[PDB]
């Protein structure tokens, strides 16, 4: 199809603020020519390992709709962003389906999202009654009663607050450093192609 506009992949990678893990941002990219070559040309520190499709063949396919998700998590929790995984982030904040057909990208962000005094602007959820379905958001602050005695929205022993903070500082090691994650999802079926790829 003949479409002129180009896809805004620089609008989701070179952004200023990235959302927290429990309120992750989702964008819709459609009706544009996608050039993924800019992603590989970056220096060999981007962890561009992805599933269902090889990175090199992305330039010759058409996709119905491409969704981009972005959030900031801990350095050693990047392993948990993969199909068929379990953990704190995988079971309470972000869940990926077993059939994903997308790509996952992550890179270091120590120089930008870490402060010497400590950054408490990033949050993650620690308490939930049940695991969450794939691609679900739970933006709700409320006391969680682990025990049986009820509380009228007040902090307590068996009454908990479900959100904690990361406390990023430049003094920790690589495993505690903040990382920025961008996850791309592709849909293929009907294909009234919106994302086309560069081909004449």
């Amino acid at each position, epitope marked *: 199809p003949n479409i*002129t*506009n*180009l896809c*805004p992949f*620089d*609008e989701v990678f*070179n*952004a*200023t*603020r990235f959302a927290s893990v429990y309120a992750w941002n989702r*964008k819709r990219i459609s009706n544009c020519v996608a050039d993924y070559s800019v992603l590989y040309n970056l220096a060999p520190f981007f962890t561009f390992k992805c599933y269902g499709v090889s990175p090199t063949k992305l330039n010759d396919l058409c996709f119905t709709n491409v969704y981009a998700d972005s959030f900031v998590i801990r350095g050693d929790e990047v392993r948990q962003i993969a199909p068929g995984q379990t953990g704190n982030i995988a079971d309470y904040n972000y869940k990926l389906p077993d059939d994903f057909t997308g790509c996952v990208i992550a890179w270091n962000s120590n*120089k*930008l999202d870490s402060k010497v005094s400590g950054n408490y602007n990033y949050l993650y959820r620690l308490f939930r009654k049940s695991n969450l379905k794939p691609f679900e958001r739970d933006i709700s602050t409320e006391i969680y009663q682990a025990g049986n005695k009820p509380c009228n929205g007040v902090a307590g022993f068996n009454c908990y607050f479900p959100l904690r903070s990361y406390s990023f500082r430049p003094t920790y090691g690589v495993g505690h450093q903040p990382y920025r994650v961008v996850v791309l999802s592709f849909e293929l079926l009907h294909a009234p192609a919106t994302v086309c790829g560069p081909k004449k």
Partner: antibody, heavy 124, light 105 residues
Framework: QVQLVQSGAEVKKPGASVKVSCKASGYPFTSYGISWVRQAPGQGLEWMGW????????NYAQKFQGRVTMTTDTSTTTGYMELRRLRSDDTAVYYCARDYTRGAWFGESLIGGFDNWGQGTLVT | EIVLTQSPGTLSLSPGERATLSCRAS???????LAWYQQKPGQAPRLLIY???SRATGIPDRFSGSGSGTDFTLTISRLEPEDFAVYYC????????FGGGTKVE
């Protein structure tokens, strides 16, 4: 290479309104926005506003909120700037710059700045 | 709005040694949202540093910048006849504001 060429100088009398053009060449027009910066003779720069070339959204400065309107046309790849109710203290050089400080499709902040300026237009 | 102040307003320096400029912010400005510009007389401004550390395209290695929080500094390793102009500092953490401007002679 990327180049932006503006219109010519104007000697508009006090009280009227003026329009300045800016034609782009050398890059995908839709992927970037256009910002406007002015410089009075003998002083520093000042920010006028921001216009998106993909969906027409605007973000004007608080000083010129109800006075300036911006408009872009994809066919000719040219931006326009309308300033109404001109005052004697508006004599300056207006600039047209390609914007990497704010996203075009989504309108979120980015890492960068005005990376390509024009020749400049003198208005009195 | 965040107000940026540059001191000194003018620098008189010998042609060949190292310079240093200041752009101090009233409030806290993120390191993501600061940039520098250069304006030779009778020309148009051009971009030098974005992100307070990174370098723009086509800028030699003698221009460097650093700083965080409230204090930002632009440093030049050595001077050339083409490096005597007015420099400005920009922020877009909240709205978008410019600096007063520092001249070098």
């Amino acid at each position: 290479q990327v180049q932006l060429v503006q219109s010519g100088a104007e000697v508009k009398k006090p009280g009227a309104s003026v329009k300045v053009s800016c034609k782009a060449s050398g890059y995908p027009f839709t992927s970037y926005g256009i910002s406007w910066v002015r410089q009075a003779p003998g002083q520093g720069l000042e920010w006028m506003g921001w216009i998106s070339t993909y969906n027409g959204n605007t973000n004007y400065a608080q000083k010129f909120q109800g006075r300036v309107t911006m408009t872009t046309d994809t066919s000719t790849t040219t931006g326009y700037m309308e300033l109404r109710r001109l005052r004697s203290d508006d004599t300056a050089v207006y600039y047209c710059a390609r914007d990497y400080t704010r996203g075009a499709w989504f309108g979120e902040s980015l890492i960068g700045g005005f990376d390509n300026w024009g020749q400049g237009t003198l208005v009195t | 709005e965040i107000v940026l102040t540059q001191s000194p307003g003018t620098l008189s320096l010998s042609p060949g040694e190292r310079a240093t400029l200041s752009c101090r912010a009233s409030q806290t400005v993120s390191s993501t949202s600061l940039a520098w510009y250069q304006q030779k007389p009778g020309q148009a401004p051009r971009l030098l540093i974005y992100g307070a550390s990174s370098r723009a395209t086509g800028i030699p290695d003698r221009f460097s910048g650093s700083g965080s929080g409230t204090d930002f500094t632009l440093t030049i390793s050595r001077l050339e006849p083409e490096d005597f102009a007015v420099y400005y500092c920009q922020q877009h953490d909240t709205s978008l504001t410019f600096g007063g401007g520092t001249k070098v002679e």
